[PDB]
Design a protein around this ligand. Structure first.
Ligand code: NA
Length: 92
DNA sequence: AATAAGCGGAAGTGGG
DNA sequence: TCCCACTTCCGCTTA
């Protein structure tokens, strides 16, 4: 099954949910979710995974928090809804 | 207060 | 057995 970081990188590459997520500085791997439209993207993540419950942005961000300990995706301090893929993730 | 978001421990579920 | 990669639940904190 696809991993969350790959789902997000794939969305950013395809542009299929451009009103829910976008690059801020793609060379640095920084991206941001839409305050008003992030739930639609969270719903899609849960459906792609086949999870029992409806996925929410909060539960998705809880998963993203675990990536911050390992560095796969860092949450930018002093900003809202803004994250940064590691260099390794961006290399493919 | 209402709303939004951050924070994160702990326990539950998948698939090895 | 026991870790993976989240998911779900709960509650406190900050804005
Ligand atoms: Na536990």
């Amino acid at each position: 099954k696809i991993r969350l970081y790959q789902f997000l990188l794939d969305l950013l590459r395809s542009g299929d949910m451009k009103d829910s997520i976008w690059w801020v500085d793609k060379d640095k791997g920084t991206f941001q979710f839409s305050s008003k439209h992030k739930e639609a993207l969270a719903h899609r993540w849960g459906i792609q995974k086949g999870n029992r419950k409806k996925m929410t942005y909060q539960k998705m961000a809880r998963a993203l928090r675990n990536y911050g300990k390992t560095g796969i995706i860092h949450k930018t301090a002093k900003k809202k809804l803004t994250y940064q893929f590691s260099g390794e993730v961006l290399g493919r």
